[PDB]
Design a protein around this ligand. Structure first.
Ligand SMILES: [Mg+2]
Ligand SMILES: [Mg+2]
Lengths: 404, 403
């Protein structure tokens, strides 16, 4: 038969879901990474009043024109503005941020002035408005500052705080149930029975889920018993928006698990044109969506990263999405490649004698090892119908995000 | 004159010692923590020779006979075969199940045809095909991760494959924080004459937590010398680092500078950078001090390029201490003055041609904080360079996850 393209599989998945709308209001310090549920519209002008941008003296243009020294009637600070008398022929010592006096027309740097006996003289011309930041020049009251669907980071939260807003409404955390199946799987700190190995995928998915801002319900390991498995699915579906199998449940093979899966929902089993991996299951349970990952650790991790991650992004209500961008760079390592599959190989991005990045391999790309995720810092995304690439050619690279 | 940024950082780093106090935590609670000791594998991974496919385990001599081989038994995942395996027969096996005693090869189901008197093999069989060997991944005894390794999704699951549930990591860095000034007001409160909302304190708090530090926020302190002294004593009493987000002298001779000079040994630098320049650093009775300038743009840049690396060393992280940069061509004409290393904000994107190029976010004035939302990278302009035209190369430093 034939293999399904990755963007095809992805677009197909995304067209089926609806982004959550349930919200909750939280103080700013608790919002890193949360999604805005509604537009943030400013109740005030920013800045709130005409203020000084420099340390210096505030004056009236008609006073400069005299050519004669102007005595300091007073001084104005941001913490305590001046409100005394400001008679004609005089100036005011003003600091950064302090509001401008009654009829001030400009602010002069402390550097472009000379102290006289009983007054201050200014050297260099003075233009109306110099060193004066005006009310509303940055933000207008009634204007939309950040649109709904915006992921909040250090770049926008402090801005929201300059508005005087202490709490904001955000979409609730996406709830994800997760578990693994297999008589060969053992828990941490327990002895290994005949033919057993330690469960690793579940911890990997748990960690990524938490760093992505989701709320995780980890149900542990379920042994190969038809009664226990059905009960696990029903419990997981009951309390979450998404249910994920980190390994053990069929992604195509006709075994006892595939039967239970199909009785509980409408599932699709795909054969993707990727490497490593290939099979992937996705479908609708009674009260949630289902994602089933392949058993191989390398394949499970790559599959979660490129399909489940963006799936969760749309569900959270985030409008900006597509994952990290890619760039073309030359390779310094011979790479082995076979046509027919988009091969996400691991490598190492680095600087060249000149200053531009170049990528090396991490070693073998088998799925019999996991260490390449640690050594490398990026994905070398080799085109579906391409073959082996030699030193010097161009390749596309995708730097790892913060999960690695 | 001025002090280069390399000079300031080096000075700072040479003065401090990384933390060594440790605590043990389960794996699921270790994201971003620093491994305190070498992790040594007590097992072989895999722990046994097993099949890589769903199919059949056989002997080379049986295949050579050319006759079909009936099934003598089966091996399941976690249910291996320990029964009889007579000459002229084969054993059924699944992915990940261990190979029976004496197995020489594994054949996938598709290179097979079910006959009436046994299973027939249709392809050539090479010795060792489709058998994963014990230890091919991790040998018992080896050191898997050295002390100093920052733990992420890349290493924690590997540790789990060893059967280890918890590991020892360095304690979190404790950082106290506060701002000062009669003009600062708290969120959800009315602004009096000349007041503005405190913005710097939140910025720092946010970055500190994302970097894995334990934050101790003391709030806003009014211009009162008695309250200032109390804030310093309190902060210094339970912290590794103390930070003033704004309001305390970075060089100017006011009442706050006097207090600073009274409680510790501080230095007031004037850096050759833009935006900003002033920065305060020194030693208090039980901690290190970092004083940021008042302008929001200056404080954030200053914290990012100087305070961030200092906290990295303190944490015990042994990873590189080199900002990741690269040279690209600019697509905007940049205005630059000789004499200051200018950390302008810009936008990196693919040209229709496929390679990266950067454009400005717009006006690089410090009176605004928006360049951080619009941009996704810094444009690090050499200290002595002048204006630059379209087509010239420049150094760019992509933003990390704090932005
Ligand atoms: Mg199984
Ligand atoms: Mg002040």
């Amino acid at each position: 038969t034939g293999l399904m393209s990755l963007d095809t599989a992805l677009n197909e998945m995304l067209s089926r879901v609806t982004p959550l709308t349930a919200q909750e209001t939280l103080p700013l310090v608790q919002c890193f990474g949360r999604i805005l549920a509604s537009d943030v519209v400013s109740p005030l002008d920013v800045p709130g009043f005409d203020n000084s941008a420099m340390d210096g003296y505030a004056v009236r243009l008609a006073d400069i024109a005299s050519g004669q020294p102007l005595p300091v009637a007073g001084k104005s600070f941001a913490g305590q503005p001046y409100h005394g008398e400001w008679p004609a022929g005089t100036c005011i010592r003003i600091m950064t941020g302090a509001p401008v006096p009654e009829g001030c027309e400009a602010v002069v740097m402390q550097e472009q002035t000379e102290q006289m006996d009983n007054g201050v003289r200014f050297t260099a011309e003075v233009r109306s408005g110099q060193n004066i930041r005006r009310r509303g020049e940055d933000i207008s009251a009634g204007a939309v500052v950040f649109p709904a669907g915006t992921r909040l980071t250090t770049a926008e939260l402090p801005v929201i705080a300059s508005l005087g807003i202490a709490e904001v409404p955000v979409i609730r955390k996406v709830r994800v149930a997760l578990f693994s199946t297999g008589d060969e799987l053992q828990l941490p700190g327990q002895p290994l029975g005949d033919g057993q190995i330690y469960d690793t995928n579940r911890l990997a998915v748990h960690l990524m889920l938490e760093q992505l801002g989701c709320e995780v319900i980890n149900l542990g390991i379920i042994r190969d018993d038809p009664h226990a498995l059905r009960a696990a699915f029903i419990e997981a579906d009951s309390q979450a928006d998404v249910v994920i199998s980190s390994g053990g449940v069929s992604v195509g093979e006709a075994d006892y698990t595939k039967t239970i899966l199909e009785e509980l929902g409408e599932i699709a089993f795909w054969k993707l044109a990727i490497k490593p991996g290939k099979p992937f299951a996705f479908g609708k349970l009674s009260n949630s969506w289902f994602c089933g990952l392949p058993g191989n650790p390398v394949s499970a991790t790559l599959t979660f990263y490129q399909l489940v991650q963006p799936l969760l992004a749309k569900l959270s209500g985030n409008t900006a999405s597509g994952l990290p961008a890619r760039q073309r760079v030359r390779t310094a390592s011979r790479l082995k490649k076979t046509p027919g599959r988009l091969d996400f190989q691991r490598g190492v991005l680095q600087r060249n004698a000149d200053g531009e990045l170049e990528v090396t391999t991490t070693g073998h790309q088998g799925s019999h090892i996991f260490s390449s995720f640690s050594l490398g810092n990026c994905f070398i995304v080799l085109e579906r119908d391409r073959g082996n690439v030699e030193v010097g050619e161009w390749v596309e690279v995708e730097p790892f995000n913060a999960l690695f």
